[PDB]
């Protein structure tokens, strides 16, 4: 196993971009510091610049639920780029997708497209405040909603992986209106409303965590966040950027039957292109310009290509057996992964909901960021590098949920299980 | 001239999205409402859903400097999407583009890609503050850097340092550190530094305005913004999202020989895909994660499709005669447009630089937003609708710069001039 060519390229990138990457995590710091450069991806696999093949479990971080470079998605894209890659004006495709999204997500009866999760989240945070008139907001430690000032305090992803604290470059005045609290803790939330009466606009959270490792809500937690927000006439926001169209067609809100006021989307609806969206309760969206006073703009927003990738992606996902298959194989890997660690005598706790899972080096049980932080990071490091050499590509971080796609076969699951047994055995 | 099909579609979008558009301007509210829905675009033209053909001067708002659906750009894209539309990891293409961007823009010796102008500007704003440690920022009335909350500050005499939020949903605390002032006003800037000693991190601006109509800097203004910032050891930031690779290969900073500390890019470097970038002075970028402590990350940032469209786009722009041709025809349209208004007897002014121009229905001359606000909007409204019927597509706003592409022929310019004479004549 060699990565000479990746090493060369990455060494050069460090002189061209910050950390030689376009996003922090890709740096591998928290797992070695030697990231691998990709050349192509197909179905459930990824290929080195050194020619190494991998069974990918990162799926470009969520977008590839139908598999990498899906035949029908690419075809729909080629045909589409013939008519232009961007108009900067209205097009029929926006309507189609808007419609599909409305039909898909319950709380969503009116949506607005953007270009990334960060845009959606910073805009939903604004509408959150514009509608209610209150400045303060409540988020959970470990959760992630993009690199927007307000959210940069007890964030997730990279800042929740390789050290990294709140700020810097964010005025204290900013993060002041942001109330943080431990995940899966209704009481902690109930207190934040008491300490700040009439000041909390609403609560935002990942209906299921993926930015602190895989973390699912406890019984009555979501149901509870819905009761307390209503009680204080405050909004409940679901950041389904990662979970949207993955945990279920209608996201976590459809699967666990909890309807929020507003919800953010991204990743999967882009089918592999930069796309985002924030929508929901009609009467709240009307505040969005040019319908309402809340200004929010985007230049490449609703562009033909992205609207096409998304249309085609949701269409593939409407096929029968989609989610059933995903949960089927995802259950095999998780159970099998925790089964293997138990045999090699390594403390670990996993879990999964559909084609999304988690695997912490700590027995748990994990309910919040703190619990998750007990993971043996030095272990995961050796484990991650291990899998890599065995031909398995996993998120270069302990605090990142795992993903599967419709392109992952029963064999891939078994092959991943094999390599895992090999790696852990020598851990 | 009919737009029944566009009316139908837009009527439906208003029930699906806020204002029935993905971005405010698209709603045509400042031109009498009722926008036109596109179906396809090729070279310098655009086509209705009703079949109407137009000589487009919006160019999807900047990205199409090589023309709509450029043959070599599309070909480079198809070939590329075969290897995947997004990896979520490092790839050789990021290095290529980063390199090209570094060679291109002077101030830029290290860059970071993002997905839109808004991401670049909000991140450059953060790095601006993180490097200097100061919270306050100075921008100009009329300029635009995206809907990031701090830029959603009310501008105009009587409220410069009042930092009042010109949009609901954004707290007062945030815009409080946003000091504003009239474009092309060195003294107004010199005062802001006196009233706020040691608190101003830097100045951000459009090296050439495009978001208040076309507005170019007066002699010594940019050179001046560079002296005063150095004097107070503060950063000078050039938002070249619109101007980058359009006013010149190296943007305004190369053409007018003024080098800033940091500079934002977008639009053209995406070749028609959602792309963004903020870079510059090496020692300042190192603060960007994972190199430094400031956090910023994007899931799609650095995706191969966008990196490919951008690579190919800059390559076409490196050909000989590129900018010379652009300035050649853009000069023909501007001069000819002002020549026509003079004849029809219309109060008008404006001009052009490379493939960017402006046209105000006022005697001016124009040096800032106020000056520009004197434009007869009711006139532009009838003028805009007029051009539309004659087969010309212009930005549905008086405060938006005009654009041309390498795909615009001498004939197109002459035909636009023709329709203009026709329209103004009956204005
Ligand atoms: C100098 C400058 N800086 C930042 C931006 C914001 O870029 P985007 O986030 O919207 O890609 C822009 C955006 N420009 C336009 C068209 N003039 C946005 C399109 C719209 O608002 O409809 C800009 O001109
Ligand atoms: C991935 C993620 C984001 C970040 O979205 P970007 O497009 O990278 O800005 C935001 N929220 C959640 C829940 C995510 O998983
Ligand atoms: N939950 C965080 C990841 N989607 C990170 C994606 C990236 O930055 O590339």
GROMACS .gro file of C-alpha atoms in nm, chain A residues 110 112 278 285-297, chain B residues 10 13-14 17-30 35:
model
   34
  110UNK     CA    1  -4.298   2.670   0.072
  112UNK     CA    2  -3.632   2.861  -0.108
  278UNK     CA    3  -3.471   2.632   0.365
  285UNK     CA    4  -4.173   3.193   0.447
  286UNK     CA    5  -4.375   3.485   0.315
  287UNK     CA    6  -4.130   3.705   0.509
  288UNK     CA    7  -3.864   3.602   0.260
  289UNK     CA    8  -3.783   3.860  -0.009
  290UNK     CA    9  -3.939   3.952  -0.248
  291UNK     CA   10  -4.249   3.827  -0.066
  292UNK     CA   11  -4.146   3.968   0.271
  293UNK     CA   12  -3.894   4.218   0.423
  294UNK     CA   13  -3.633   3.957   0.512
  295UNK     CA   14  -3.359   4.003   0.254
  296UNK     CA   15  -3.182   3.695   0.119
  297UNK     CA   16  -3.029   3.655  -0.223
  437UNK     CA   17  -4.434   3.226  -1.270
  440UNK     CA   18  -4.390   2.953  -0.862
  441UNK     CA   19  -4.540   3.221  -0.641
  444UNK     CA   20  -4.131   2.969  -0.349
  445UNK     CA   21  -4.110   3.313  -0.183
  446UNK     CA   22  -4.191   3.562  -0.456
  447UNK     CA   23  -4.186   3.265  -0.691
  448UNK     CA   24  -3.812   3.304  -0.744
  449UNK     CA   25  -3.485   3.178  -0.599
  450UNK     CA   26  -3.346   3.530  -0.579
  451UNK     CA   27  -3.530   3.865  -0.528
  452UNK     CA   28  -3.419   4.056  -0.840
  453UNK     CA   29  -3.560   3.775  -1.057
  454UNK     CA   30  -3.912   3.881  -0.960
  455UNK     CA   31  -3.892   4.195  -1.178
  456UNK     CA   32  -4.061   4.410  -0.911
  457UNK     CA   33  -3.854   4.718  -0.995
  462UNK     CA   34  -4.044   3.823  -1.527
   0.00000   0.00000   0.00000
